[PDB]
Amino acid sequence: LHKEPATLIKAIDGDTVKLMYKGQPMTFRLLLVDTPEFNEKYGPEASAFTKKMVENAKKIEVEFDKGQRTDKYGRGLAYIYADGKMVNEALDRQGLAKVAYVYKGNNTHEQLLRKAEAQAKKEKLNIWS
Ligand SMILES: Cc1cn([C@H]2C[C@H](OP(=O)(O)O)[C@@H](COP(=O)(O)O)O2)c(=O)[nH]c1=O
Ligand SMILES: [Ca+2]
Ligand SMILES: [Ca+2]
């Protein structure tokens, strides 16, 4: 996989963010994770965590997997890095997201994210309280 530079437009919620990518606005849905909806428990906490992570990044990178690049709503499907730290993994590790929507094409970082989830689970963090 390869990391491509992108710039922030706006945070949306825990697992969705609007970036400029190749000079076009594009909403991105985070691969392999599901943060609670904003209107659910831990949703606000997930939204704030992702927002803080992307707004404080000097550098944002988009990393597509080997399968489909866009979902049925036209959102890019990617791993998103903020100063070299993967937002998908970070949410997982804090128990603000769970591993989800695991599809065969697009699962390069599955074991890593499950590893993160297991640690959050062990620590009974947030969602795993
Ligand atoms: C992570 C991911 C989500 N999605 C779609 C499935 C869900 O659409 P459906 O609601 O029609 O089932 C949606 C959930 O993400 P959001 O909740 O941010 O919209 O994103 C994919 O299609 N592939 C993916 O890899
Ligand atoms: Ca979302
Ligand atoms: Ca979600």
PDB file of N, CA, C and O in Angstrom, residues 56-123:
ATOM      1  N   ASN A  56      -5.162  18.750  14.174  1.00  0.00           N
ATOM      2  CA  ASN A  56      -3.845  19.024  14.744  1.00  0.00           C
ATOM      3  C   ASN A  56      -2.693  18.439  13.936  1.00  0.00           C
ATOM      4  O   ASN A  56      -1.525  18.720  14.210  1.00  0.00           O
ATOM      5  N   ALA A  57      -3.032  17.705  12.881  1.00  0.00           N
ATOM      6  CA  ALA A  57      -2.025  17.110  12.007  1.00  0.00           C
ATOM      7  C   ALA A  57      -1.384  18.157  11.089  1.00  0.00           C
ATOM      8  O   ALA A  57      -2.075  18.988  10.487  1.00  0.00           O
ATOM      9  N   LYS A  58      -0.056  18.178  11.072  1.00  0.00           N
ATOM     10  CA  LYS A  58       0.681  18.927  10.067  1.00  0.00           C
ATOM     11  C   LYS A  58       0.541  18.248   8.706  1.00  0.00           C
ATOM     12  O   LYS A  58       0.517  18.911   7.672  1.00  0.00           O
ATOM     13  N   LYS A  59       0.465  16.920   8.713  1.00  0.00           N
ATOM     14  CA  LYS A  59       0.378  16.157   7.477  1.00  0.00           C
ATOM     15  C   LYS A  59      -0.683  15.066   7.550  1.00  0.00           C
ATOM     16  O   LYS A  59      -0.685  14.232   8.463  1.00  0.00           O
ATOM     17  N   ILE A  60      -1.576  15.058   6.568  1.00  0.00           N
ATOM     18  CA  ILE A  60      -2.557  13.979   6.450  1.00  0.00           C
ATOM     19  C   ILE A  60      -2.266  13.147   5.204  1.00  0.00           C
ATOM     20  O   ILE A  60      -1.895  13.697   4.165  1.00  0.00           O
ATOM     21  N   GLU A  61      -2.304  11.826   5.353  1.00  0.00           N
ATOM     22  CA  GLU A  61      -2.129  10.943   4.216  1.00  0.00           C
ATOM     23  C   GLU A  61      -3.304  10.003   4.100  1.00  0.00           C
ATOM     24  O   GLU A  61      -3.907   9.591   5.102  1.00  0.00           O
ATOM     25  N   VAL A  62      -3.633   9.698   2.854  1.00  0.00           N
ATOM     26  CA  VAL A  62      -4.683   8.759   2.511  1.00  0.00           C
ATOM     27  C   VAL A  62      -4.019   7.496   1.958  1.00  0.00           C
ATOM     28  O   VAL A  62      -3.055   7.577   1.177  1.00  0.00           O
ATOM     29  N   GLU A  63      -4.454   6.339   2.452  1.00  0.00           N
ATOM     30  CA  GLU A  63      -3.910   5.072   1.989  1.00  0.00           C
ATOM     31  C   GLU A  63      -5.058   4.155   1.590  1.00  0.00           C
ATOM     32  O   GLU A  63      -5.778   3.651   2.451  1.00  0.00           O
ATOM     33  N   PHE A  64      -5.249   3.977   0.283  1.00  0.00           N
ATOM     34  CA  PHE A  64      -6.235   3.014  -0.232  1.00  0.00           C
ATOM     35  C   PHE A  64      -5.736   1.569  -0.054  1.00  0.00           C
ATOM     36  O   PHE A  64      -4.527   1.321   0.018  1.00  0.00           O
ATOM     37  N   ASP A  65      -6.673   0.632   0.070  1.00  0.00           N
ATOM     38  CA  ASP A  65      -6.337  -0.783   0.078  1.00  0.00           C
ATOM     39  C   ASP A  65      -6.416  -1.312  -1.344  1.00  0.00           C
ATOM     40  O   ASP A  65      -6.457  -0.530  -2.312  1.00  0.00           O
ATOM     41  N   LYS A  66      -6.353  -2.632  -1.471  1.00  0.00           N
ATOM     42  CA  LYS A  66      -6.198  -3.266  -2.771  1.00  0.00           C
ATOM     43  C   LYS A  66      -7.551  -3.550  -3.422  1.00  0.00           C
ATOM     44  O   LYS A  66      -7.621  -3.922  -4.589  1.00  0.00           O
ATOM     45  N   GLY A  67      -8.628  -3.315  -2.681  1.00  0.00           N
ATOM     46  CA  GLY A  67      -9.975  -3.580  -3.181  1.00  0.00           C
ATOM     47  C   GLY A  67     -10.665  -2.309  -3.634  1.00  0.00           C
ATOM     48  O   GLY A  67     -10.020  -1.394  -4.145  1.00  0.00           O
ATOM     49  N   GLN A  68     -11.969  -2.222  -3.417  1.00  0.00           N
ATOM     50  CA  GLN A  68     -12.694  -1.052  -3.897  1.00  0.00           C
ATOM     51  C   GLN A  68     -12.350   0.255  -3.177  1.00  0.00           C
ATOM     52  O   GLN A  68     -12.083   0.280  -1.956  1.00  0.00           O
ATOM     53  N   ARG A  69     -12.236   1.324  -3.961  1.00  0.00           N
ATOM     54  CA  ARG A  69     -11.757   2.599  -3.434  1.00  0.00           C
ATOM     55  C   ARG A  69     -12.886   3.494  -2.957  1.00  0.00           C
ATOM     56  O   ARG A  69     -12.652   4.468  -2.238  1.00  0.00           O
ATOM     57  N   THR A  70     -14.094   3.245  -3.451  1.00  0.00           N
ATOM     58  CA  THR A  70     -15.231   4.095  -3.078  1.00  0.00           C
ATOM     59  C   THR A  70     -16.426   3.246  -2.666  1.00  0.00           C
ATOM     60  O   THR A  70     -16.637   2.159  -3.204  1.00  0.00           O
ATOM     61  N   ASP A  71     -17.223   3.754  -1.730  1.00  0.00           N
ATOM     62  CA  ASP A  71     -18.403   3.035  -1.308  1.00  0.00           C
ATOM     63  C   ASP A  71     -19.620   3.450  -2.131  1.00  0.00           C
ATOM     64  O   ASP A  71     -19.481   4.159  -3.137  1.00  0.00           O
ATOM     65  N   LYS A  72     -20.791   2.918  -1.787  1.00  0.00           N
ATOM     66  CA  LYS A  72     -21.968   3.118  -2.610  1.00  0.00           C
ATOM     67  C   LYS A  72     -22.480   4.554  -2.580  1.00  0.00           C
ATOM     68  O   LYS A  72     -23.328   4.929  -3.384  1.00  0.00           O
ATOM     69  N   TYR A  73     -21.988   5.340  -1.632  1.00  0.00           N
ATOM     70  CA  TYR A  73     -22.348   6.752  -1.547  1.00  0.00           C
ATOM     71  C   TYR A  73     -21.299   7.677  -2.163  1.00  0.00           C
ATOM     72  O   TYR A  73     -21.441   8.895  -2.104  1.00  0.00           O
ATOM     73  N   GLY A  74     -20.268   7.100  -2.770  1.00  0.00           N
ATOM     74  CA  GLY A  74     -19.227   7.894  -3.401  1.00  0.00           C
ATOM     75  C   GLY A  74     -18.110   8.338  -2.476  1.00  0.00           C
ATOM     76  O   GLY A  74     -17.184   9.033  -2.926  1.00  0.00           O
ATOM     77  N   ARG A  75     -18.089   7.808  -1.249  1.00  0.00           N
ATOM     78  CA  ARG A  75     -17.026   8.134  -0.306  1.00  0.00           C
ATOM     79  C   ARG A  75     -15.801   7.266  -0.586  1.00  0.00           C
ATOM     80  O   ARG A  75     -15.927   6.045  -0.747  1.00  0.00           O
ATOM     81  N   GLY A  76     -14.613   7.862  -0.469  1.00  0.00           N
ATOM     82  CA  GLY A  76     -13.364   7.100  -0.563  1.00  0.00           C
ATOM     83  C   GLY A  76     -13.263   6.176   0.631  1.00  0.00           C
ATOM     84  O   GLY A  76     -13.706   6.527   1.713  1.00  0.00           O
ATOM     85  N   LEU A  77     -12.723   4.979   0.431  1.00  0.00           N
ATOM     86  CA  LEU A  77     -12.516   4.045   1.528  1.00  0.00           C
ATOM     87  C   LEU A  77     -11.021   3.879   1.758  1.00  0.00           C
ATOM     88  O   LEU A  77     -10.301   3.361   0.897  1.00  0.00           O
ATOM     89  N   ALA A  78     -10.540   4.324   2.907  1.00  0.00           N
ATOM     90  CA  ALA A  78      -9.090   4.376   3.093  1.00  0.00           C
ATOM     91  C   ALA A  78      -8.681   4.238   4.548  1.00  0.00           C
ATOM     92  O   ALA A  78      -9.470   4.497   5.469  1.00  0.00           O
ATOM     93  N   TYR A  79      -7.393   3.999   4.741  1.00  0.00           N
ATOM     94  CA  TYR A  79      -6.763   4.254   6.025  1.00  0.00           C
ATOM     95  C   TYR A  79      -6.257   5.694   6.013  1.00  0.00           C
ATOM     96  O   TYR A  79      -5.675   6.161   5.023  1.00  0.00           O
ATOM     97  N   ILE A  80      -6.526   6.422   7.090  1.00  0.00           N
ATOM     98  CA  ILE A  80      -6.150   7.833   7.166  1.00  0.00           C
ATOM     99  C   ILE A  80      -5.130   8.024   8.280  1.00  0.00           C
ATOM    100  O   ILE A  80      -5.278   7.434   9.361  1.00  0.00           O
ATOM    101  N   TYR A  81      -4.014   8.675   7.935  1.00  0.00           N
ATOM    102  CA  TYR A  81      -2.900   8.902   8.848  1.00  0.00           C
ATOM    103  C   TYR A  81      -2.775  10.381   9.173  1.00  0.00           C
ATOM    104  O   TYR A  81      -2.914  11.243   8.296  1.00  0.00           O
ATOM    105  N   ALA A  82      -2.500  10.669  10.438  1.00  0.00           N
ATOM    106  CA  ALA A  82      -2.307  12.037  10.884  1.00  0.00           C
ATOM    107  C   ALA A  82      -0.931  12.093  11.501  1.00  0.00           C
ATOM    108  O   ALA A  82      -0.662  11.381  12.466  1.00  0.00           O
ATOM    109  N   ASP A  83      -0.022  12.791  10.825  1.00  0.00           N
ATOM    110  CA  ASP A  83       1.392  12.796  11.191  1.00  0.00           C
ATOM    111  C   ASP A  83       1.923  11.380  11.417  1.00  0.00           C
ATOM    112  O   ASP A  83       2.613  11.109  12.399  1.00  0.00           O
ATOM    113  N   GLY A  84       1.567  10.475  10.508  1.00  0.00           N
ATOM    114  CA  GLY A  84       2.136   9.135  10.508  1.00  0.00           C
ATOM    115  C   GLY A  84       1.440   8.146  11.433  1.00  0.00           C
ATOM    116  O   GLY A  84       1.842   6.982  11.508  1.00  0.00           O
ATOM    117  N   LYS A  85       0.432   8.616  12.169  1.00  0.00           N
ATOM    118  CA  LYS A  85      -0.352   7.756  13.062  1.00  0.00           C
ATOM    119  C   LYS A  85      -1.695   7.447  12.434  1.00  0.00           C
ATOM    120  O   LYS A  85      -2.445   8.359  12.095  1.00  0.00           O
ATOM    121  N   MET A  86      -2.033   6.167  12.347  1.00  0.00           N
ATOM    122  CA  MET A  86      -3.265   5.781  11.654  1.00  0.00           C
ATOM    123  C   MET A  86      -4.484   6.051  12.525  1.00  0.00           C
ATOM    124  O   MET A  86      -4.552   5.620  13.687  1.00  0.00           O
ATOM    125  N   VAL A  87      -5.369   6.902  12.017  1.00  0.00           N
ATOM    126  CA  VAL A  87      -6.565   7.274  12.758  1.00  0.00           C
ATOM    127  C   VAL A  87      -7.443   6.057  13.029  1.00  0.00           C
ATOM    128  O   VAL A  87      -7.947   5.896  14.150  1.00  0.00           O
ATOM    129  N   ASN A  88      -7.601   5.191  12.022  1.00  0.00           N
ATOM    130  CA  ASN A  88      -8.379   3.968  12.185  1.00  0.00           C
ATOM    131  C   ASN A  88      -7.902   3.153  13.396  1.00  0.00           C
ATOM    132  O   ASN A  88      -8.720   2.700  14.205  1.00  0.00           O
ATOM    133  N   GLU A  89      -6.587   2.925  13.481  1.00  0.00           N
ATOM    134  CA  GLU A  89      -6.012   2.154  14.574  1.00  0.00           C
ATOM    135  C   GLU A  89      -6.192   2.896  15.897  1.00  0.00           C
ATOM    136  O   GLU A  89      -6.503   2.281  16.921  1.00  0.00           O
ATOM    137  N   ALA A  90      -5.969   4.210  15.876  1.00  0.00           N
ATOM    138  CA  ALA A  90      -6.019   5.020  17.106  1.00  0.00           C
ATOM    139  C   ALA A  90      -7.393   4.966  17.771  1.00  0.00           C
ATOM    140  O   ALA A  90      -7.492   4.759  18.980  1.00  0.00           O
ATOM    141  N   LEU A  91      -8.445   5.121  16.971  1.00  0.00           N
ATOM    142  CA  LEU A  91      -9.821   4.974  17.458  1.00  0.00           C
ATOM    143  C   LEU A  91     -10.059   3.614  18.098  1.00  0.00           C
ATOM    144  O   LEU A  91     -10.611   3.519  19.189  1.00  0.00           O
ATOM    145  N   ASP A  92      -9.707   2.564  17.362  1.00  0.00           N
ATOM    146  CA  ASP A  92      -9.794   1.197  17.837  1.00  0.00           C
ATOM    147  C   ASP A  92      -9.115   1.038  19.196  1.00  0.00           C
ATOM    148  O   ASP A  92      -9.717   0.528  20.149  1.00  0.00           O
ATOM    149  N   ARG A  93      -7.863   1.498  19.278  1.00  0.00           N
ATOM    150  CA  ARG A  93      -7.025   1.280  20.456  1.00  0.00           C
ATOM    151  C   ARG A  93      -7.592   1.999  21.680  1.00  0.00           C
ATOM    152  O   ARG A  93      -7.444   1.538  22.801  1.00  0.00           O
ATOM    153  N   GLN A  94      -8.365   3.055  21.442  1.00  0.00           N
ATOM    154  CA  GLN A  94      -8.977   3.801  22.533  1.00  0.00           C
ATOM    155  C   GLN A  94     -10.383   3.313  22.858  1.00  0.00           C
ATOM    156  O   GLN A  94     -11.077   3.927  23.663  1.00  0.00           O
ATOM    157  N   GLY A  95     -10.819   2.237  22.211  1.00  0.00           N
ATOM    158  CA  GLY A  95     -12.197   1.770  22.377  1.00  0.00           C
ATOM    159  C   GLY A  95     -13.253   2.785  21.944  1.00  0.00           C
ATOM    160  O   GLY A  95     -14.361   2.806  22.481  1.00  0.00           O
ATOM    161  N   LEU A  96     -12.953   3.568  20.912  1.00  0.00           N
ATOM    162  CA  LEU A  96     -13.931   4.521  20.399  1.00  0.00           C
ATOM    163  C   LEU A  96     -14.476   4.041  19.057  1.00  0.00           C
ATOM    164  O   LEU A  96     -15.331   4.699  18.446  1.00  0.00           O
ATOM    165  N   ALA A  97     -13.938   2.925  18.589  1.00  0.00           N
ATOM    166  CA  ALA A  97     -14.434   2.245  17.390  1.00  0.00           C
ATOM    167  C   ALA A  97     -14.271   0.749  17.562  1.00  0.00           C
ATOM    168  O   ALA A  97     -13.462   0.287  18.358  1.00  0.00           O
ATOM    169  N   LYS A  98     -15.045  -0.016  16.805  1.00  0.00           N
ATOM    170  CA  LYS A  98     -14.854  -1.447  16.787  1.00  0.00           C
ATOM    171  C   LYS A  98     -14.526  -1.843  15.361  1.00  0.00           C
ATOM    172  O   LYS A  98     -14.838  -1.105  14.426  1.00  0.00           O
ATOM    173  N   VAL A  99     -13.793  -2.936  15.201  1.00  0.00           N
ATOM    174  CA  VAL A  99     -13.544  -3.484  13.867  1.00  0.00           C
ATOM    175  C   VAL A  99     -14.890  -3.857  13.237  1.00  0.00           C
ATOM    176  O   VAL A  99     -15.779  -4.370  13.936  1.00  0.00           O
ATOM    177  N   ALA A 100     -15.059  -3.535  11.946  1.00  0.00           N
ATOM    178  CA  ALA A 100     -16.363  -3.593  11.276  1.00  0.00           C
ATOM    179  C   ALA A 100     -16.213  -3.544   9.762  1.00  0.00           C
ATOM    180  O   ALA A 100     -15.154  -3.177   9.249  1.00  0.00           O
ATOM    181  N   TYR A 101     -17.255  -3.966   9.045  1.00  0.00           N
ATOM    182  CA  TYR A 101     -17.248  -3.890   7.576  1.00  0.00           C
ATOM    183  C   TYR A 101     -15.950  -4.484   7.057  1.00  0.00           C
ATOM    184  O   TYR A 101     -15.245  -3.849   6.262  1.00  0.00           O
ATOM    185  N   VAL A 102     -15.615  -5.679   7.528  1.00  0.00           N
ATOM    186  CA  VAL A 102     -14.417  -6.362   7.052  1.00  0.00           C
ATOM    187  C   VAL A 102     -14.715  -7.127   5.761  1.00  0.00           C
ATOM    188  O   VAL A 102     -15.427  -8.139   5.767  1.00  0.00           O
ATOM    189  N   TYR A 103     -14.207  -6.602   4.650  1.00  0.00           N
ATOM    190  CA  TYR A 103     -14.400  -7.219   3.341  1.00  0.00           C
ATOM    191  C   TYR A 103     -13.095  -7.715   2.722  1.00  0.00           C
ATOM    192  O   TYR A 103     -12.032  -7.131   2.921  1.00  0.00           O
ATOM    193  N   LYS A 104     -13.201  -8.739   1.882  1.00  0.00           N
ATOM    194  CA  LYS A 104     -12.029  -9.477   1.431  1.00  0.00           C
ATOM    195  C   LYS A 104     -11.060  -8.608   0.641  1.00  0.00           C
ATOM    196  O   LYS A 104      -9.844  -8.740   0.777  1.00  0.00           O
ATOM    197  N   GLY A 105     -11.589  -7.752  -0.223  1.00  0.00           N
ATOM    198  CA  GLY A 105     -10.729  -6.860  -1.003  1.00  0.00           C
ATOM    199  C   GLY A 105      -9.867  -5.933  -0.161  1.00  0.00           C
ATOM    200  O   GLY A 105      -8.730  -5.623  -0.518  1.00  0.00           O
ATOM    201  N   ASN A 106     -10.420  -5.469   0.956  1.00  0.00           N
ATOM    202  CA  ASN A 106      -9.947  -4.264   1.623  1.00  0.00           C
ATOM    203  C   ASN A 106      -9.672  -4.551   3.090  1.00  0.00           C
ATOM    204  O   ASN A 106     -10.312  -3.963   3.971  1.00  0.00           O
ATOM    205  N   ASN A 107      -8.748  -5.469   3.360  1.00  0.00           N
ATOM    206  CA  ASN A 107      -8.536  -5.931   4.731  1.00  0.00           C
ATOM    207  C   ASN A 107      -7.064  -6.005   5.117  1.00  0.00           C
ATOM    208  O   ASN A 107      -6.696  -6.757   6.022  1.00  0.00           O
ATOM    209  N   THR A 108      -6.232  -5.214   4.436  1.00  0.00           N
ATOM    210  CA  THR A 108      -4.783  -5.264   4.642  1.00  0.00           C
ATOM    211  C   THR A 108      -4.388  -5.109   6.107  1.00  0.00           C
ATOM    212  O   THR A 108      -3.568  -5.887   6.617  1.00  0.00           O
ATOM    213  N   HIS A 109      -5.030  -4.169   6.800  1.00  0.00           N
ATOM    214  CA  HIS A 109      -4.709  -3.906   8.204  1.00  0.00           C
ATOM    215  C   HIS A 109      -5.642  -4.544   9.223  1.00  0.00           C
ATOM    216  O   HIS A 109      -5.693  -4.090  10.354  1.00  0.00           O
ATOM    217  N   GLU A 110      -6.359  -5.602   8.837  1.00  0.00           N
ATOM    218  CA  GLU A 110      -7.318  -6.235   9.753  1.00  0.00           C
ATOM    219  C   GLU A 110      -6.679  -6.747  11.052  1.00  0.00           C
ATOM    220  O   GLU A 110      -7.199  -6.507  12.146  1.00  0.00           O
ATOM    221  N   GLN A 111      -5.604  -7.525  10.933  1.00  0.00           N
ATOM    222  CA  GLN A 111      -5.007  -8.128  12.115  1.00  0.00           C
ATOM    223  C   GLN A 111      -4.514  -7.043  13.077  1.00  0.00           C
ATOM    224  O   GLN A 111      -4.673  -7.156  14.295  1.00  0.00           O
ATOM    225  N   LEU A 112      -3.877  -6.014  12.527  1.00  0.00           N
ATOM    226  CA  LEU A 112      -3.431  -4.868  13.325  1.00  0.00           C
ATOM    227  C   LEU A 112      -4.581  -4.193  14.085  1.00  0.00           C
ATOM    228  O   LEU A 112      -4.428  -3.821  15.263  1.00  0.00           O
ATOM    229  N   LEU A 113      -5.699  -3.955  13.406  1.00  0.00           N
ATOM    230  CA  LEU A 113      -6.852  -3.319  14.070  1.00  0.00           C
ATOM    231  C   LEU A 113      -7.532  -4.222  15.107  1.00  0.00           C
ATOM    232  O   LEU A 113      -7.931  -3.761  16.182  1.00  0.00           O
ATOM    233  N   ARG A 114      -7.604  -5.515  14.827  1.00  0.00           N
ATOM    234  CA  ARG A 114      -8.101  -6.445  15.833  1.00  0.00           C
ATOM    235  C   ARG A 114      -7.199  -6.505  17.070  1.00  0.00           C
ATOM    236  O   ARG A 114      -7.680  -6.713  18.182  1.00  0.00           O
ATOM    237  N   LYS A 115      -5.886  -6.460  16.842  1.00  0.00           N
ATOM    238  CA  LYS A 115      -4.899  -6.327  17.909  1.00  0.00           C
ATOM    239  C   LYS A 115      -5.168  -5.110  18.802  1.00  0.00           C
ATOM    240  O   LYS A 115      -5.235  -5.228  20.029  1.00  0.00           O
ATOM    241  N   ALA A 116      -5.356  -3.949  18.178  1.00  0.00           N
ATOM    242  CA  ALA A 116      -5.742  -2.729  18.892  1.00  0.00           C
ATOM    243  C   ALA A 116      -7.042  -2.889  19.691  1.00  0.00           C
ATOM    244  O   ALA A 116      -7.098  -2.566  20.881  1.00  0.00           O
ATOM    245  N   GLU A 117      -8.059  -3.462  19.057  1.00  0.00           N
ATOM    246  CA  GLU A 117      -9.355  -3.662  19.706  1.00  0.00           C
ATOM    247  C   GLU A 117      -9.235  -4.549  20.939  1.00  0.00           C
ATOM    248  O   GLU A 117      -9.891  -4.317  21.957  1.00  0.00           O
ATOM    249  N   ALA A 118      -8.448  -5.610  20.819  1.00  0.00           N
ATOM    250  CA  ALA A 118      -8.239  -6.526  21.935  1.00  0.00           C
ATOM    251  C   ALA A 118      -7.599  -5.851  23.150  1.00  0.00           C
ATOM    252  O   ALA A 118      -7.980  -6.127  24.291  1.00  0.00           O
ATOM    253  N   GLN A 119      -6.717  -4.883  22.904  1.00  0.00           N
ATOM    254  CA  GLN A 119      -6.076  -4.140  23.990  1.00  0.00           C
ATOM    255  C   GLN A 119      -7.062  -3.193  24.668  1.00  0.00           C
ATOM    256  O   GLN A 119      -7.168  -3.173  25.897  1.00  0.00           O
ATOM    257  N   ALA A 120      -7.834  -2.474  23.852  1.00  0.00           N
ATOM    258  CA  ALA A 120      -8.916  -1.617  24.348  1.00  0.00           C
ATOM    259  C   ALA A 120      -9.934  -2.427  25.158  1.00  0.00           C
ATOM    260  O   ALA A 120     -10.387  -1.990  26.217  1.00  0.00           O
ATOM    261  N   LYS A 121     -10.274  -3.615  24.658  1.00  0.00           N
ATOM    262  CA  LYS A 121     -11.179  -4.535  25.352  1.00  0.00           C
ATOM    263  C   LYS A 121     -10.609  -4.962  26.710  1.00  0.00           C
ATOM    264  O   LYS A 121     -11.323  -5.005  27.720  1.00  0.00           O
ATOM    265  N   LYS A 122      -9.331  -5.336  26.704  1.00  0.00           N
ATOM    266  CA  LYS A 122      -8.617  -5.729  27.916  1.00  0.00           C
ATOM    267  C   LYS A 122      -8.660  -4.622  28.967  1.00  0.00           C
ATOM    268  O   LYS A 122      -8.819  -4.889  30.162  1.00  0.00           O
ATOM    269  N   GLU A 123      -8.560  -3.377  28.510  1.00  0.00           N
ATOM    270  CA  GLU A 123      -8.502  -2.227  29.411  1.00  0.00           C
ATOM    271  C   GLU A 123      -9.896  -1.706  29.746  1.00  0.00           C
ATOM    272  O   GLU A 123     -10.052  -0.853  30.624  1.00  0.00           O
TER     273      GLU A 123
END
